[PDB]
Amino acid sequence: SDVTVNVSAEKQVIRGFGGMNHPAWAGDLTAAQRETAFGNGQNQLGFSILRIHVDENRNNWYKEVETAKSAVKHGAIVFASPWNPPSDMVETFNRNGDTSAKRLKYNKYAAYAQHLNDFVTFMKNNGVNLYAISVQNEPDYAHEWTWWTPQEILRFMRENAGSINARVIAPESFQYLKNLSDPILNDPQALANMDILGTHLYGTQVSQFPYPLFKQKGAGKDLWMTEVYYPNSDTNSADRWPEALDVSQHIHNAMVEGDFQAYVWWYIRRSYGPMKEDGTISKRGYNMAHFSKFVRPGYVRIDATKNPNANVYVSAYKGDNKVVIVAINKSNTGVNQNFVLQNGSASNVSRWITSSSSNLQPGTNLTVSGNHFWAHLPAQSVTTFVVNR
Ligand SMILES: CO[C@H]1[C@H](O)[C@@H](O)[C@@H](O[C@H]2[C@H](O[C@@H]3CO[C@@H](O)[C@H](O)[C@H]3O)OC[C@@H](O)[C@@H]2O)O[C@@H]1C(=O)O
Numbered sequence: 001s002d003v004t005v006n007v008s009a010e011k012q013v014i015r016g017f018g019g020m021n022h023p024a025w026a027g028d029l030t031a032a033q034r035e036t037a038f039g040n041g042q043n044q045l046g047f048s049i050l051r052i053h054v055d056e057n058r059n060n061w062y063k064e065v066e067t068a069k070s071a072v073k074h075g076a077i078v079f080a081s082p083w084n085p086p087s088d089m090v091e092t093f094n095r096n097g098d099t100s101a102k103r104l105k106y107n108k109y110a111a112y113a114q115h116l117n118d119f120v121t122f123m124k125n126n127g128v129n130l131y132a133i134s135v136q137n138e139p140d141y142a143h144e145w146t147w148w149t150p151q152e153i154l155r156f157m158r159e160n161a162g163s164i165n166a167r168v169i170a171p172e173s174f175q176y177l178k179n180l181s182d183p184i185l186n187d188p189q190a191l192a193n194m195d196i197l198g199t200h201l202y203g204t205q206v207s208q209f210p211y212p213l214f215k216q217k218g219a220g221k222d223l224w225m226t227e228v229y230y231p232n233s234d235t236n237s238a239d240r241w242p243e244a245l246d247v248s249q250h251i252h253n254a255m256v257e258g259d260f261q262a263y264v265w266w267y268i269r270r271s272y273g274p275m276k277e278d279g280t281i282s283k284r285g286y287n288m289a290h291f292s293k294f295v296r297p298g299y300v301r302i303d304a305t306k307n308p309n310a311n312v313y314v315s316a317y318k319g320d321n322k323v324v325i326v327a328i329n330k331s332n333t334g335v336n337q338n339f340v341l342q343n344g345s346a347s348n349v350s351r352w353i354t355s356s357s358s359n360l361q362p363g364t365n366l367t368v369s370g371n372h373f374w375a376h377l378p379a380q381s382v383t384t385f386v387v388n389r
Pocket of ligand 1: 025137138174202227233270
């Protein structure tokens, strides 16, 4: 059919795409791997965001620095997520019959705010201006870390988040369970101390991607997808095709349905991650690259016919005089797609394709006839068009 791309219907502003680094749990990236992750050259990922963790023990903080420095050097922004407070701030409690359940002590909130602040300060003294810090990773799924109820999160956002010398991300539900975030959005004071609503999407159905309340109360707030792997963490799955195509479809849904402004993967380097263990880019990686390499920080999502044929998914962005279109064909049949540009005129179109047999591989240039151009979308393929204005 037709894909209409309206250059004037502006949507969310994009902050970027990236992944996690965890030297303790995964092993720090090597110098070469840092180039592959944050460089936007040929055979590199052009990740524009790096997540790192706030260790509960300050003596471990130093381990995050080299990789974080590297990301900044390349223009990536860095943010951080805590799993646990320092142990002296944590108590056990009876959570519905589970007595091993950990939480932050009600009289330790201020001290934990200071812990987080110390990390910001520490990172600064090593030449990393942390873009943002989180309150707690997955407080509603904390079997192996620190639990917070919605009300405990609220109290901290009302009373302590304001003392944090950085942008504050909250609440980082594992599944984008609105009940964890509703209380904040419904409280002027807590809302005021939140700069980024953060979430994960483990098991989240596409119908739960929209967030009406956020649209209603969240003016001036960022909306970030701070952790995921998809569609699984199967050992050595990173190269499986057409499986990898799920990655770009997921990002498509985050951008188009969730209106997210950041998409952050889990471990950058892993047998199921964007980067393989030999330090090369996986098929999952190239699926991310179709966004990360072209949709730079600052770009804006624009309205575009999201799903103009069965298994064909489209999203568009504008920035730096270009329109970027990402077209995912998940079917077993090549389709010819017609792309119409409204409220804007263009000339030349470049493109890169990823399929069973190729990675981000240049296609033939195409030219705009009036306000449109035809392009063929190979079977089980992702294409990124770059349109010059
Ligand atoms: C195949 O093993 C991988 C696991 O499937 C994967 O969950 C991850 O496990 C981590 C664990 O990470 C949590 C993953 O779920 C997220 O919701 C949550 O935010 C994470 O904290 O934390 C302990 C760590 O030692 C494990 O590595 O990664 C596994 C892997 O090593 O590949």
